Amino acid sequence: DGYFKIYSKHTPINLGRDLPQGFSALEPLVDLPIGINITRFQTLLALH
Amino acid sequence: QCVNLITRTQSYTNSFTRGVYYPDKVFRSSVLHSTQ
Amino acid sequence: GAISSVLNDILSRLDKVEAEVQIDRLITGRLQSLQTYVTQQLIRAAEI
Amino acid sequence: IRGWIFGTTLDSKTQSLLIVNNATNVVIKVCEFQFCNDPFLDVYYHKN
Amino acid sequence: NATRFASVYAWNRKRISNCVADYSVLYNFAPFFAFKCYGVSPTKLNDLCFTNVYADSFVIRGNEVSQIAPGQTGNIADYNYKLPDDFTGCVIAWNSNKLDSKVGGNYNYLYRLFRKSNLKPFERDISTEIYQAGNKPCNGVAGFNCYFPLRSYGFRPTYGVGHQPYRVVVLSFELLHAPATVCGPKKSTNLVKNKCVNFNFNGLTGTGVLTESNKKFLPFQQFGRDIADTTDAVRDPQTLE
């Protein structure tokens, strides 16, 4: 309803593969009052 | 100016338990809490 | 049906004329909750 | 990986959002952006 | 108190934060015709505080003030400035013909009356793209019974009576649930502990004894809670204890 909310988490992980079957929870990060329609998205690479 | 780059090769994996988050700005301990 | 279940939020946020119309929703449901408990306890007590 | 484009149309006809993250801070902005096709961030060693 | 108000099709939104909301100097500075609060009483605003506060701001014909009520449906509330049924906040409005209206007419305050769909609460649609209000398609600026926003309501000083430009501000706050940033004019006391007191933290009044916790709230948490959803613990806003 017109707010874009972000939550996040750091996870230290070893050589035990990826995306691990343990557990963790994300903390709130920001509440953005933007008031716009989001329908799609993309992500920024940064080759230097 | 812009340039077409960054080709993608998707694959599928199983997100076992991931992506739980603290649902509200409240503290709670020693409790099992139900949320929608 | 009240705006909060915490009776002090009602009493922080509203004046008497509409605070009492919210409080009475909680008096009604809480009182029904006791009436349920005491009926259940009388029904068990008669089995014990 | 440095951030995300979010929006409904991505071609300035309606607003859309950038999250951009660098070595020091984050910028968040919602605008009538025209995104071209492959958004990436072009950090370089600028001699001058 | 600024020169020109924003148009209702593109309502302006300011975030009020890191400050004291003494409203008394506003009420004695200027009259107002409307003063309707929702989920709060105007009487209590002295002893109270707010989490994040936004003012929504625009100018509108006085009839449409009725359309600013929580979740109400009508031409401005369906396509321009919808606010939800669960909006907690206050609406304040006053006549502007003494300030914005012009004897040659004013045309800066655009509004809309048609769209492809009824918009979502607190969403804004500034897009000038043409709307197909006729059955056949419409392209460019022209079209058979086609338009986008409609003509700005012409304001003349003597012309409108209940129908001239009224300035509107809507304060759409949330309260008592997060680390707060905008508080009423009531001054704080010192703390006391181990003694029974009428406490008030960020507007959360109660009666109890206060003690130092062993509990470890994360920086985003202001209140801690129990099985009856009453507040069991609190972070002291003057020292983060």
Ligand SMILES: *[C@@H]1O[C@H](CO)[C@@H](O[C@@H]2O[C@H](CO)[C@@H](O[C@H]3O[C@H](CO)[C@@H](O)[C@H](O)[C@@H]3O)[C@H](O)[C@H]2NC(C)=O)[C@H](O)[C@H]1NC(C)=O
């Ligand atoms: C990462 O990208 C940021 C922009 O996306 C960039 O931020 C810019 O940094 C400079 C230097 O701190 C700021 O310059 C201003 O600093 C103060 C602000 O009060 C003024 O006194 C100065 O005169 C000057 O105007 C820019 O304002 C700032 N831009 C924004 C939008 O905040 C970072 O520097 C980038 N970091 C790296 C490592 O690339």
Ligand SMILES: *[C@@H]1O[C@H](CO)[C@@H](O[C@@H]2O[C@H](CO)[C@@H](O)[C@H](O)[C@H]2NC(C)=O)[C@H](O)[C@H]1NC(C)=O
């Ligand atoms: C948010 O943006 C999307 C994308 O433009 C809108 O979805 C379109 O809505 C129209 C009208 O219902 C349809 O004709 C399109 O086919 C939809 N496209 C998609 C990809 O779903 C959506 O309606 C917008 N929401 C609001 C409230 O404006």
Ligand SMILES: *[C@@H]1O[C@H](CO)[C@@H](O)[C@H](O)[C@H]1NC(C)=O
């Ligand atoms: C309100 O704005 C006018 C100019 O439009 C100015 O003359 C007046 O002093 C302002 N009022 C206050 C309280 O500053």
Ligand SMILES: *[C@@H]1O[C@H](CO)[C@@H](O)[C@H](O)[C@H]1NC(C)=O
């Ligand atoms: C309030 O004042 C104290 C000193 O009495 C100070 O340590 C504290 O940072 C102040 N509160 C805030 C919100 O800065």
